[PDB]
Coordinates of C-alpha atoms in Angstrom, one line a residue:
Chain A
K1 CA -3.6 41.3 -63.3
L2 CA -0.7 40.9 -66.0
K3 CA 0.5 43.8 -67.8
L4 CA 2.9 41.9 -69.9
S5 CA 4.6 43.9 -72.9
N6 CA 6.8 43.1 -75.9
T7 CA 10.0 45.1 -75.4
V8 CA 12.3 45.3 -78.5
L9 CA 15.7 46.8 -79.0
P10 CA 15.7 50.7 -79.9
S11 CA 15.7 51.5 -83.6
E12 CA 18.1 54.5 -83.1
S13 CA 20.8 52.0 -82.3
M14 CA 20.1 50.0 -85.4
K15 CA 20.7 53.2 -87.7
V16 CA 24.1 53.8 -85.9
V17 CA 25.2 50.3 -86.8
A18 CA 24.0 50.5 -90.4
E19 CA 25.7 53.8 -91.1
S20 CA 28.9 52.7 -89.4
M21 CA 28.9 49.9 -92.1
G22 CA 28.5 51.7 -95.2
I23 CA 24.7 51.4 -95.6
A24 CA 23.5 54.9 -95.4
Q25 CA 20.1 56.5 -95.9
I26 CA 18.0 53.9 -94.4
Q27 CA 14.2 54.5 -94.0
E28 CA 12.5 54.1 -90.5
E29 CA 10.3 51.2 -91.8
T30 CA 13.5 49.6 -92.9
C31 CA 15.2 50.4 -89.5
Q32 CA 12.2 49.0 -87.6
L33 CA 12.3 45.9 -89.6
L34 CA 15.8 45.1 -88.3
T35 CA 14.8 45.6 -84.6
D36 CA 11.9 43.3 -84.4
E37 CA 13.8 40.5 -86.2
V38 CA 16.9 40.6 -83.9
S39 CA 14.7 41.0 -80.7
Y40 CA 12.8 37.9 -81.6
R41 CA 16.1 36.0 -82.0
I42 CA 17.2 37.3 -78.5
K43 CA 13.8 36.3 -77.0
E44 CA 14.0 33.0 -79.0
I45 CA 17.4 32.2 -77.5
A46 CA 16.9 33.5 -73.9
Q47 CA 13.7 31.3 -73.8
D48 CA 15.9 28.5 -75.1
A49 CA 18.8 29.1 -72.8
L50 CA 16.4 28.9 -69.9
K51 CA 15.9 25.2 -70.8
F52 CA 19.7 24.6 -70.1
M53 CA 19.5 26.4 -66.9
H54 CA 16.5 24.4 -65.6
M55 CA 18.0 20.9 -66.9
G56 CA 21.4 21.8 -65.1
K57 CA 19.4 22.3 -61.9
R58 CA 20.8 26.0 -61.4
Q59 CA 18.7 29.3 -60.8
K60 CA 21.2 31.5 -62.5
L61 CA 21.6 31.7 -66.3
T62 CA 25.2 31.2 -66.8
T63 CA 27.3 32.5 -69.8
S64 CA 27.5 28.9 -71.1
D65 CA 23.7 28.4 -71.4
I66 CA 23.7 30.8 -74.4
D67 CA 26.5 29.0 -75.9
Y68 CA 24.4 25.7 -75.9
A69 CA 21.2 27.7 -76.8
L70 CA 23.0 29.1 -79.9
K71 CA 24.4 25.6 -80.8
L72 CA 20.8 24.3 -80.5
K73 CA 19.5 26.8 -83.1
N74 CA 22.3 25.8 -85.5
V75 CA 23.9 29.3 -85.0
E76 CA 27.7 29.1 -84.1
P77 CA 28.3 30.0 -80.4
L78 CA 31.2 32.3 -81.4
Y79 CA 30.4 36.0 -80.6
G80 CA 33.5 38.0 -81.4
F81 CA 33.9 36.7 -84.9
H82 CA 32.1 35.0 -87.7
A83 CA 33.8 32.3 -90.0
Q84 CA 32.0 32.0 -93.3
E85 CA 33.7 28.7 -94.1
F86 CA 33.0 27.5 -90.5
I87 CA 35.8 24.8 -90.7
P88 CA 38.5 26.1 -88.3
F89 CA 36.0 26.4 -85.5
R90 CA 32.6 24.3 -86.1
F91 CA 30.0 25.1 -83.4
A92 CA 32.8 25.4 -80.8
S93 CA 32.2 27.8 -78.0
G94 CA 35.3 30.2 -77.2
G95 CA 33.7 31.3 -73.9
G96 CA 32.7 34.7 -74.9
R97 CA 34.8 37.8 -74.6
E98 CA 35.6 39.2 -71.2
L99 CA 34.7 42.8 -71.9
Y100 CA 33.2 45.6 -69.8
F101 CA 31.4 49.0 -70.1
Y102 CA 33.8 50.7 -67.7
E103 CA 37.0 49.2 -69.3
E104 CA 40.1 51.0 -70.2
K105 CA 40.2 49.8 -73.8
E106 CA 43.9 49.7 -74.0
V107 CA 46.3 47.5 -71.9
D108 CA 50.0 47.0 -71.9
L109 CA 51.0 43.6 -73.3
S110 CA 53.3 42.8 -70.2
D111 CA 50.9 43.7 -67.6
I112 CA 48.8 40.6 -68.5
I113 CA 52.0 38.6 -68.4
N114 CA 53.3 39.7 -65.0
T115 CA 50.0 39.2 -63.0
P116 CA 49.8 36.0 -60.9
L117 CA 47.3 33.5 -62.3
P118 CA 44.1 32.5 -60.1
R119 CA 44.1 29.4 -58.0
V120 CA 42.4 26.3 -59.5
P121 CA 40.0 25.3 -56.9
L122 CA 39.4 22.0 -55.4
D123 CA 38.1 19.0 -57.5
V124 CA 34.5 17.6 -56.7
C125 CA 34.4 15.2 -53.8
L126 CA 31.6 13.2 -52.2
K127 CA 30.8 13.8 -48.4
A128 CA 27.9 12.3 -46.5
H129 CA 26.0 13.7 -43.5
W130 CA 22.6 13.4 -41.8
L131 CA 19.6 15.5 -42.6
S132 CA 17.4 13.5 -40.5
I133 CA 17.8 11.1 -37.4
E134 CA 14.5 9.3 -37.1
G135 CA 12.5 12.4 -38.0
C136 CA 14.7 15.0 -36.1
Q137 CA 17.2 17.3 -38.0
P138 CA 20.6 17.5 -36.2
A139 CA 22.3 20.8 -35.5
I140 CA 25.5 19.8 -37.4
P141 CA 27.4 22.5 -39.4
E142 CA 26.1 20.8 -42.6
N143 CA 22.6 21.7 -41.6
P144 CA 21.2 25.3 -41.8
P145 CA 20.0 26.4 -38.4
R146 CA -1.5 24.8 -3.2
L147 CA 2.1 24.2 -4.2
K148 CA 3.5 25.7 -7.6
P149 CA 5.0 22.8 -9.7
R150 CA 8.7 21.9 -9.3
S151 CA 10.4 23.6 -12.1
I152 CA 13.1 22.4 -14.2
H153 CA 16.4 24.1 -15.4
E154 CA 16.2 25.5 -18.9
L155 CA 19.3 23.4 -19.9
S156 CA 19.2 19.6 -20.6
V157 CA 21.5 17.4 -18.7
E158 CA 23.3 16.6 -22.0
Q159 CA 23.7 20.5 -22.3
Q160 CA 24.6 20.8 -18.6
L161 CA 27.1 17.9 -19.0
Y162 CA 28.5 19.6 -22.1
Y163 CA 28.9 23.0 -20.1
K164 CA 30.7 21.1 -17.4
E165 CA 33.0 19.4 -19.9
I166 CA 33.8 22.5 -22.0
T167 CA 34.5 24.6 -18.8
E168 CA 36.8 21.9 -17.3
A169 CA 38.5 21.6 -20.6
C170 CA 39.0 25.4 -21.0
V171 CA 40.9 25.7 -17.8
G172 CA 43.7 24.2 -19.8
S173 CA 44.9 21.2 -17.9
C174 CA 45.6 19.5 -21.4
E175 CA 46.2 21.6 -24.5
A176 CA 44.5 19.4 -27.2
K177 CA 41.5 19.5 -24.8
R178 CA 41.6 23.2 -24.6
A179 CA 42.1 23.6 -28.3
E180 CA 38.9 21.4 -29.3
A181 CA 36.8 23.1 -26.4
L182 CA 38.0 26.4 -27.9
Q183 CA 36.8 25.3 -31.5
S184 CA 33.6 23.8 -30.0
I185 CA 33.0 27.3 -28.4
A186 CA 33.8 28.8 -31.8
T187 CA 31.4 26.9 -33.9
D188 CA 28.6 25.4 -31.8
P189 CA 25.2 26.6 -33.2
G190 CA 23.2 25.7 -30.2
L191 CA 25.5 27.6 -27.8
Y192 CA 23.0 30.4 -27.3
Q193 CA 20.7 29.8 -24.1
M194 CA 23.8 28.5 -22.5
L195 CA 25.5 31.8 -23.1
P196 CA 24.5 33.6 -19.7
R197 CA 26.3 30.7 -17.7
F198 CA 29.5 31.2 -19.9
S199 CA 29.5 34.9 -19.4
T200 CA 28.9 34.6 -15.7
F201 CA 31.7 31.9 -15.6
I202 CA 34.2 34.2 -17.4
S203 CA 33.3 37.4 -15.5
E204 CA 33.2 35.8 -12.1
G205 CA 36.5 33.9 -12.8
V206 CA 38.6 36.8 -13.7
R207 CA 37.6 38.8 -10.6
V208 CA 38.5 35.9 -8.2
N209 CA 41.4 35.0 -10.5
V210 CA 43.0 38.5 -10.0
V211 CA 42.9 38.1 -6.2
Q212 CA 45.9 35.8 -6.8
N213 CA 47.4 36.8 -10.3
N214 CA 47.1 33.4 -11.9
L215 CA 48.3 34.1 -15.5
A216 CA 47.2 30.8 -17.0
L217 CA 43.8 31.0 -15.5
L218 CA 43.6 34.4 -17.2
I219 CA 45.1 33.5 -20.5
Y220 CA 42.7 30.6 -20.9
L221 CA 39.7 32.7 -20.1
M222 CA 40.8 35.4 -22.6
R223 CA 41.1 32.7 -25.3
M224 CA 37.6 31.6 -24.2
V225 CA 36.3 35.2 -24.8
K226 CA 38.0 35.2 -28.4
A227 CA 36.4 31.8 -28.9
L228 CA 33.1 33.2 -28.0
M229 CA 33.4 36.3 -30.1
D230 CA 34.0 34.7 -33.6
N231 CA 31.1 32.3 -33.3
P232 CA 28.6 33.8 -35.9
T233 CA 25.4 32.2 -34.5
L234 CA 25.2 33.5 -31.0
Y235 CA 24.0 37.2 -30.1
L236 CA 26.7 38.8 -27.9
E237 CA 26.0 42.3 -27.3
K238 CA 23.4 41.5 -24.6
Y239 CA 26.4 40.1 -22.6
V240 CA 29.3 42.5 -23.5
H241 CA 28.5 44.6 -20.4
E242 CA 30.0 41.6 -18.5
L243 CA 32.7 40.8 -21.0
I244 CA 34.3 44.3 -21.4
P245 CA 35.1 45.1 -17.7
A246 CA 36.9 41.6 -17.6
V247 CA 39.1 42.3 -20.5
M248 CA 39.9 45.9 -19.2
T249 CA 40.9 44.2 -15.8
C250 CA 43.5 41.8 -17.8
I251 CA 45.1 45.0 -19.5
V252 CA 45.0 47.5 -16.8
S253 CA 45.8 45.5 -13.7
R254 CA 48.8 44.8 -11.5
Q255 CA 50.4 41.4 -11.3
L256 CA 50.2 39.7 -7.8
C257 CA 52.5 36.8 -8.9
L258 CA 56.3 37.0 -9.8
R259 CA 57.0 40.4 -11.5
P260 CA 59.5 39.5 -14.1
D261 CA 59.8 36.3 -16.2
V262 CA 56.2 35.9 -17.1
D263 CA 56.0 39.6 -17.9
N264 CA 56.7 38.3 -21.4
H265 CA 53.3 36.5 -21.1
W266 CA 51.9 39.4 -19.1
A267 CA 52.6 41.5 -22.3
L268 CA 50.7 39.0 -24.3
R269 CA 47.9 38.7 -21.6
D270 CA 47.8 42.6 -22.5
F271 CA 48.4 41.6 -26.1
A272 CA 45.4 39.2 -26.2
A273 CA 43.3 41.6 -24.0
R274 CA 44.0 44.6 -26.3
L275 CA 43.3 42.5 -29.3
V276 CA 39.9 41.5 -28.0
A277 CA 39.2 45.0 -26.8
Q278 CA 39.5 46.7 -30.1
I279 CA 37.6 43.7 -31.8
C280 CA 34.8 44.6 -29.2
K281 CA 35.0 48.2 -30.2
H282 CA 34.9 47.2 -33.9
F283 CA 31.7 45.3 -33.3
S284 CA 28.6 46.2 -31.0
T285 CA 29.0 49.9 -32.0
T286 CA 26.2 52.5 -31.4
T287 CA 26.6 56.3 -30.9
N288 CA 29.1 57.4 -28.1
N289 CA 28.7 54.4 -25.8
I290 CA 31.3 51.7 -26.0
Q291 CA 34.4 52.9 -28.0
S292 CA 34.5 56.3 -26.6
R293 CA 33.9 55.0 -22.9
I294 CA 37.0 52.7 -23.1
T295 CA 38.9 55.4 -24.9
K296 CA 38.2 57.9 -22.1
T297 CA 39.2 55.4 -19.4
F298 CA 42.5 54.5 -21.4
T299 CA 43.4 58.4 -21.6
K300 CA 42.6 59.0 -17.7
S301 CA 44.9 55.8 -17.1
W302 CA 47.4 57.6 -19.2
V303 CA 47.3 61.1 -17.8
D304 CA 47.1 59.9 -14.1
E305 CA 50.3 60.9 -12.3
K306 CA 52.5 58.3 -10.8
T307 CA 50.9 55.2 -12.0
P308 CA 51.6 51.4 -11.4
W309 CA 53.8 50.7 -14.3
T310 CA 52.1 47.5 -15.2
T311 CA 48.9 49.4 -15.4
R312 CA 50.8 52.0 -17.5
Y313 CA 52.2 49.3 -19.9
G314 CA 48.7 47.7 -20.3
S315 CA 46.9 51.0 -20.8
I316 CA 49.6 52.0 -23.2
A317 CA 49.0 48.8 -25.2
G318 CA 45.4 49.3 -25.1
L319 CA 45.4 52.9 -26.5
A320 CA 48.1 51.7 -29.2
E321 CA 46.0 49.0 -30.7
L322 CA 42.9 51.2 -31.5
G323 CA 43.6 51.7 -35.2
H324 CA 45.0 54.2 -37.7
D325 CA 43.7 57.6 -36.6
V326 CA 43.6 56.9 -32.9
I327 CA 47.4 57.1 -32.5
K328 CA 47.5 59.7 -35.3
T329 CA 45.4 62.1 -32.9
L330 CA 46.2 60.9 -29.3
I331 CA 49.9 59.8 -28.9
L332 CA 51.1 63.1 -30.5
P333 CA 51.2 65.7 -27.8
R334 CA 52.7 63.3 -25.0
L335 CA 56.2 62.2 -26.2
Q336 CA 57.8 64.6 -23.5
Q337 CA 56.0 62.9 -20.7
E338 CA 56.9 59.5 -21.9
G339 CA 60.7 60.4 -22.1
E340 CA 60.6 62.0 -18.6
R341 CA 59.2 58.8 -17.3
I342 CA 62.0 56.7 -19.0
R343 CA 64.7 59.2 -17.6
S344 CA 63.3 58.8 -13.9
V345 CA 63.3 54.9 -14.1
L346 CA 67.1 55.2 -15.6
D347 CA 68.2 57.6 -12.9
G348 CA 67.0 56.0 -9.8
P349 CA 69.2 53.0 -8.9
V350 CA 66.3 50.7 -7.8
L351 CA 66.5 47.6 -10.1
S352 CA 64.7 44.8 -8.0
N353 CA 61.4 46.4 -8.6
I354 CA 59.4 46.0 -11.9
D355 CA 59.6 49.7 -12.8
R356 CA 62.7 49.5 -15.3
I357 CA 61.0 46.4 -17.1
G358 CA 57.8 48.4 -17.4
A359 CA 59.6 51.2 -18.7
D360 CA 61.6 49.4 -21.4
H361 CA 58.5 47.7 -22.7
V362 CA 56.5 51.0 -22.7
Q363 CA 59.2 52.7 -24.6
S364 CA 59.7 49.9 -27.2
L365 CA 55.9 49.9 -28.0
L366 CA 55.6 53.7 -28.2
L367 CA 58.6 53.9 -30.5
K368 CA 57.2 51.3 -32.9
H369 CA 53.8 53.1 -33.1
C370 CA 55.5 56.4 -33.7
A371 CA 57.6 54.9 -36.5
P372 CA 54.7 54.1 -38.9
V373 CA 52.5 57.2 -37.6
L374 CA 55.5 59.0 -39.3
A375 CA 56.0 56.5 -42.2
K376 CA 52.3 57.1 -42.8
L377 CA 52.0 60.9 -42.9
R378 CA 55.2 62.4 -44.3
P379 CA 58.1 61.5 -46.7
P380 CA 61.3 59.5 -45.4
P381 CA 63.5 62.6 -45.8
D382 CA 66.1 63.7 -43.1
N383 CA 65.8 60.4 -41.2
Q384 CA 69.0 60.9 -39.2
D385 CA 68.6 63.8 -36.7
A386 CA 65.4 65.4 -37.3
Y387 CA 63.7 63.2 -34.8
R388 CA 65.9 65.0 -32.2
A389 CA 63.1 67.7 -32.4
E390 CA 61.0 65.0 -30.6
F391 CA 63.4 64.4 -27.8
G392 CA 65.4 61.9 -29.9
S393 CA 63.8 58.8 -28.6
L394 CA 63.9 56.4 -31.5
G395 CA 65.8 58.6 -34.1
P396 CA 67.8 56.5 -36.6
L397 CA 66.5 53.0 -35.3
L398 CA 62.9 54.6 -35.8
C399 CA 64.2 55.6 -39.4
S400 CA 65.3 52.0 -40.0
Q401 CA 62.0 50.7 -38.7
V402 CA 60.3 53.1 -41.3
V403 CA 62.7 51.8 -44.0
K404 CA 61.7 48.1 -43.1
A405 CA 58.0 49.3 -43.3
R406 CA 58.8 50.8 -46.7
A407 CA 60.6 47.5 -48.0
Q408 CA 57.4 45.7 -46.8
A409 CA 55.3 48.1 -48.9
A410 CA 57.6 47.5 -51.9
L411 CA 57.2 43.7 -51.6
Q412 CA 53.3 44.2 -51.5
Chain B
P1 CA 23.2 14.1 -29.1
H2 CA 23.3 17.7 -28.3
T3 CA 22.1 17.9 -32.0
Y4 CA 18.9 15.7 -32.3
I5 CA 17.9 14.8 -28.6
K6 CA 17.1 16.4 -25.1
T7 CA 16.0 15.5 -21.3
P8 CA 15.0 17.8 -18.1
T9 CA 16.8 18.1 -14.8
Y10 CA 15.5 19.0 -11.4
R11 CA 17.0 20.7 -8.3
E12 CA 18.8 18.5 -5.6
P13 CA 16.1 17.7 -3.0
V14 CA 17.1 17.6 0.6
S15 CA 15.3 14.5 2.0
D16 CA 17.3 14.1 5.1
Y17 CA 15.6 13.7 8.6
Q18 CA 18.5 15.1 10.5
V19 CA 18.8 18.5 8.7
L20 CA 15.0 18.7 8.3
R21 CA 14.8 18.4 12.2
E22 CA 17.6 21.0 12.4
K23 CA 15.9 23.4 10.1
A24 CA 12.5 23.2 11.6
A25 CA 14.0 23.5 15.1
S26 CA 16.2 26.4 14.2
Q27 CA 13.3 28.2 12.4
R28 CA 11.1 27.8 15.5
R29 CA 13.7 29.0 17.9
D30 CA 14.5 32.0 15.7
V31 CA 10.8 33.0 15.1
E32 CA 9.9 32.7 18.9
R33 CA 13.1 34.7 19.8
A34 CA 12.1 37.5 17.3
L35 CA 8.6 37.5 18.6
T36 CA 9.6 37.7 22.2
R37 CA 12.2 40.3 21.8
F38 CA 9.7 42.6 19.7
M39 CA 7.0 42.2 22.4
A40 CA 9.4 43.0 25.2
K41 CA 10.6 46.0 23.3
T42 CA 7.3 47.5 22.5
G43 CA 5.8 47.2 25.9
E44 CA 6.5 47.3 29.7
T45 CA 9.6 45.3 30.5
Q46 CA 11.6 43.8 33.5
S47 CA 15.1 42.8 33.7
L48 CA 17.0 40.4 35.8
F49 CA 20.2 42.7 35.7
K50 CA 20.3 46.4 36.4
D51 CA 19.1 48.3 33.2
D52 CA 19.1 45.3 30.9
Chain C
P1 CA 25.0 16.8 -13.9
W2 CA 22.1 14.4 -13.1
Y3 CA 20.7 17.1 -10.7
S4 CA 21.1 20.8 -11.5
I5 CA 24.7 22.3 -11.2
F6 CA 23.3 25.8 -11.7
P7 CA 20.2 27.3 -9.5
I8 CA 16.6 27.3 -11.1
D9 CA 15.4 30.8 -11.6
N10 CA 11.8 32.2 -10.6
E11 CA 9.8 31.2 -13.8
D12 CA 7.3 33.8 -13.0
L13 CA 9.9 36.7 -12.9
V14 CA 11.8 35.3 -16.0
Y15 CA 8.7 34.5 -18.1
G16 CA 5.4 36.1 -16.6
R17 CA 4.2 39.5 -17.5
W18 CA 4.2 40.9 -14.0
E19 CA 3.9 44.2 -15.8
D20 CA 0.3 43.5 -16.1
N21 CA -0.1 43.9 -12.3
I22 CA 1.0 47.6 -12.4
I23 CA -2.0 49.9 -11.8
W24 CA -1.3 52.8 -14.2
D25 CA -4.7 54.5 -13.6
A26 CA -6.7 53.7 -10.6
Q27 CA -10.1 54.7 -12.1
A28 CA -9.4 53.6 -15.7
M29 CA -7.9 50.1 -14.9
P30 CA -7.9 48.4 -18.4
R31 CA -8.7 44.8 -16.9
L32 CA -10.2 43.6 -13.6
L33 CA -7.8 42.3 -11.0
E34 CA -8.7 39.4 -8.7
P35 CA -7.7 38.3 -5.1
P36 CA -4.4 36.3 -5.2
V37 CA -4.3 32.9 -3.3
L38 CA -1.0 31.9 -1.5
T39 CA 0.9 29.5 -3.6
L40 CA 3.8 28.3 -1.5
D41 CA 6.4 27.5 -4.2
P42 CA 8.3 24.4 -3.1
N43 CA 11.2 25.3 -5.5
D44 CA 12.6 27.8 -2.9
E45 CA 14.8 26.3 -0.2
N46 CA 14.5 27.6 3.5
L47 CA 10.8 26.5 3.3
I48 CA 10.2 23.4 5.3
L49 CA 7.6 22.2 3.0
Chain D
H1 CA 2.0 24.9 4.9
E2 CA 0.0 26.5 7.6
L3 CA 2.1 28.7 9.9
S4 CA 2.6 27.5 13.5
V5 CA 1.0 29.4 16.3
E6 CA 4.3 31.1 17.2
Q7 CA 4.9 32.5 13.7
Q8 CA 1.1 33.1 13.2
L9 CA 1.3 35.3 16.2
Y10 CA 4.5 36.9 14.9
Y11 CA 2.9 37.7 11.5
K12 CA -0.1 39.1 13.1
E13 CA 1.8 41.3 15.5
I14 CA 4.4 42.5 12.8
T15 CA 1.6 43.3 10.2
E16 CA -0.6 45.2 12.8
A17 CA 2.3 47.0 14.0
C18 CA 2.7 48.6 10.4
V19 CA -0.8 49.8 10.0
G20 CA -0.5 53.2 11.9
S21 CA -1.4 53.1 15.6
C22 CA 1.9 54.5 16.7
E23 CA 5.2 55.2 15.1
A24 CA 7.6 53.6 17.7
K25 CA 6.0 50.2 17.5
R26 CA 6.3 50.6 13.7
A27 CA 10.2 51.4 14.0
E28 CA 10.6 48.3 16.1
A29 CA 8.6 46.2 13.8
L30 CA 10.6 47.4 10.7
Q31 CA 13.8 46.9 12.8
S32 CA 12.6 43.3 13.5
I33 CA 11.9 42.6 9.9
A34 CA 15.3 44.1 8.7
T35 CA 17.4 42.2 11.5
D36 CA 16.0 38.7 12.1
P37 CA 17.5 35.6 10.9
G38 CA 14.5 33.2 10.6
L39 CA 11.8 34.9 8.8
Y40 CA 11.7 32.5 5.8
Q41 CA 8.4 30.5 5.8
Chain E
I1 CA 15.5 46.2 -6.5
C2 CA 17.0 46.1 -9.9
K3 CA 20.6 46.6 -8.6
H4 CA 20.6 43.6 -6.3
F5 CA 18.5 41.2 -8.5
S6 CA 18.8 42.0 -12.2
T7 CA 20.6 39.1 -13.9
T8 CA 20.8 38.5 -17.8
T9 CA 18.3 35.6 -17.2
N10 CA 16.0 37.8 -15.3
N11 CA 15.9 41.1 -17.4
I12 CA 14.5 42.9 -14.7
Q13 CA 16.2 46.3 -15.3
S14 CA 15.6 46.3 -19.0
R15 CA 12.0 45.4 -18.7
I16 CA 11.7 48.2 -15.9
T17 CA 13.3 50.8 -18.2
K18 CA 11.0 49.8 -21.1
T19 CA 7.9 50.4 -19.1
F20 CA 9.2 53.7 -17.7
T21 CA 10.2 54.6 -21.1
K22 CA 6.9 53.9 -23.0
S23 CA 5.1 55.6 -20.1
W24 CA 7.3 58.8 -20.5
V25 CA 7.6 59.1 -24.3
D26 CA 3.9 58.5 -24.9
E27 CA 1.8 61.6 -24.7
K28 CA -1.6 61.8 -22.8
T29 CA 0.1 60.6 -19.5
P30 CA -0.5 62.8 -16.5
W31 CA 2.0 64.8 -14.8
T32 CA 2.1 62.5 -11.7
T33 CA 3.0 59.4 -13.8
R34 CA 5.5 61.4 -15.9
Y35 CA 7.0 62.4 -12.7
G36 CA 7.1 58.8 -11.5
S37 CA 8.8 57.7 -14.9
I38 CA 11.3 60.4 -14.8
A39 CA 12.0 59.7 -11.1
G40 CA 12.7 56.1 -11.6
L41 CA 14.7 56.6 -14.9
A42 CA 16.8 59.2 -13.0
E43 CA 17.4 56.9 -10.1
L44 CA 18.6 54.1 -12.4
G45 CA 21.8 56.0 -13.1
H46 CA 23.9 58.4 -15.3
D47 CA 24.0 56.4 -18.6
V48 CA 20.1 55.8 -18.5
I49 CA 19.6 59.6 -18.3
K50 CA 22.1 60.0 -21.0
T51 CA 20.2 57.8 -23.4
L52 CA 16.6 58.3 -22.2
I53 CA 16.1 61.6 -20.6
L54 CA 18.3 63.8 -22.8
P55 CA 16.7 63.2 -26.2
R56 CA 13.4 64.5 -24.9
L57 CA 14.6 67.6 -23.4
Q58 CA 12.6 69.5 -25.9
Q59 CA 9.4 68.2 -24.0
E60 CA 10.5 70.8 -21.4
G61 CA 9.1 73.5 -23.9
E62 CA 5.8 71.5 -24.1
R63 CA 5.9 71.6 -20.3
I64 CA 6.7 75.4 -20.3
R65 CA 3.7 75.9 -22.7
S66 CA 1.6 75.1 -19.6
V67 CA 3.6 77.0 -16.9
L68 CA 4.7 80.5 -18.1
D69 CA 1.5 80.9 -20.0
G70 CA -1.6 78.9 -18.9
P71 CA -5.3 80.0 -19.6
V72 CA -6.4 78.0 -16.5
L73 CA -4.0 79.0 -13.6
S74 CA -6.1 77.8 -10.7
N75 CA -6.0 74.0 -12.0
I76 CA -3.7 71.3 -10.5
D77 CA -1.4 70.8 -13.5
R78 CA 0.9 73.8 -12.5
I79 CA 2.2 72.3 -9.3
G80 CA 2.9 69.0 -10.9
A81 CA 4.4 70.6 -14.0
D82 CA 6.9 72.6 -12.0
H83 CA 7.6 69.5 -9.8
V84 CA 8.4 67.7 -12.9
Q85 CA 10.6 70.8 -14.0

C-alpha cells in the first residue's frame, strides 16, 4: 500500500506574487503554469539536497545542503538577492537569511550591537575509548547503557570490593579519596543493584551516628546522599522512604557534641540537609504524599511551644528553603512569635547555654527571607520606618538588603 | 573490571569442630530442657522443694 | 570481600512467586497443588547440617 | 538431617498439643514455642 | 509479618498490597474475600487506607445496593455485606 501524491504550491499564492509585481489580469491556466514549474524545482533540489545529507553522513538536512544543491544545478545559492552580472558574488553562499514568521520586522540598530556575542565552541579533538573488550562492551561513560543449593550473593566480589572501597572512602579519612568516591557515586551507571546496600548504610549510619552527634560522619553521609541523587541512571524513589527520615534527622535534631563553634558547620549540616530536602520534594512528586508531609512536619515543628532551639533553627531553615510561594504563604502570620522568642533569649541572662546562638541564627535567616518576600511583592517605597508595623525586626537593614537585591536585578 | 567482567561469592562456612560440638551440644540440651519442662507442666508433677 | 560481607537473602522469597500458593477459592482452584517435601536449606545458619 | 529422638518427641508432643484435645496443653505448647531458645533445626 | 521482615530486597509489603489491591478492585470477588482484602489493607496502616481504600469509597454505594434494597433478603450476602460495611 502506497498512496503517494504530487503536492504542488498553491496557485492562490502565485497570483498574489504576480499582482504585487505589476503583472495584473493573469488567467488561471497561466497561474497554474507557474506553480507546477516551481514546485518541480523545489522537488528537484530537495531530492538533490538529500544527496549531500547522505554524503555528509547526517540524518538532518541542514541549511547548507540546499546551498550546495543549488550550486550543483548552476543556480546561485543567494536567496535574498539576485545579481544579474553575477560578478560580485559568483555561486557564493551567504548562509541564508535569519528570518522568522513570528518576527518583529523592525529592530533598533543599537540593540544588535549591545547584545553579547555567542561563545565559539571547542575545536575538534580525537579521543579514543573501547567499544568491546574481547567481545564484551564495557560500562564506561562513552558507552550507552534433599538440601537446597548453596546460594550466591547477588553482588560480584569486584562489586562487593567496590562497595567496601567506596564506603570506606566516603567516611572521609582523606579528602581526595572522598571527592573521587563522591564522583564515582555521582556517575557510575552500574550502581543500581547495589543501591539497597548504600541506602541501608546511609540510613543505619545516621541513626547510630546521632547517638553521639558526630558532625563529620553526618556531613559525609549527606554528601553521599547528594551524590546519590544527581546520578541519572539509578531509580531512587524506591529507596526515598529510607532517605528522607535520615535528612529530616540531620535538620531537626539536637547536637550531642559541643554546642558552639561547629554550630557554624551545624548550620551547614542544616544547610546541606535543607538543600537535599527541597531537591527531594522537587523530584519524586505525586499527589499529596511527600512535599505536603514534610511541610506538615516542619509546621508542627514550628508551632510547637518551647522547642529545642537547635531543632527550632533547623526546622526554620527547612521551611525557609522551600521556594517562592511557600514563604509567601507560611512565614507571614508568625513574625510576632519570632520577635517574642528573640526578646526572651535577650532578657534571660543565661549565656552559657546555646539558646542565644540559636536565636541569633534564626533571626538572621528569617530577616533575609522576609527581605525579598518584600522586595518580590511591593515597591521599595517607605523603607525607613514602615517595617515598624511588623515589630521593627530588620527595618532599614532589611531595606538595605532589598536595595542590594534590586542592584543585583539591575546587573542581571 | 566492574565494566566488562564478573564472579560469584558465597557465605562464610563454619567448619570448626569446636563450635560444631558446642552448637550440637547446646541445641540438644535446650530441646531436651524444653521437652521436659513442657511435659512436667502439662501433667502430674512432683517437686524437691515445697511448691516448686 | 572473598566471602560475602552482606548476608544472602531467601531466593524463594526474593524471587519465587509464592503468591501462587494462596488458595483464593477452595472449590475453584486454578491449578492442582502437590504435597511438599522437606528441603532443609543449608544456607540458613543455626542448622547443624 | 533427621531429627534426633529428643527433638522428634518434642515435635510430636508440640504438634499434637495444638490439634484440639484440650486448651491448657495448647496454651503451654504455644508458650513453649514462643519462649524456647533452641527450636532451630 | 511485613513489618518485621519487609526489606527493599524482599518487597514483601509491596507484593502483599498488590495482591490485596487486585483482589479488592476486581469485581466478581465474594464478600468474604473482599472482607479479607479490606481487613489486611486496613491493618497495614494509615497511608495505605489513604491511597487504596479512599478512592473506592463509591463502592459502598454498590454495597448498599444489596443491603437497603435486596430482592433476596434470606441469602447469606447480607451479613457479609454489612460486616464489610
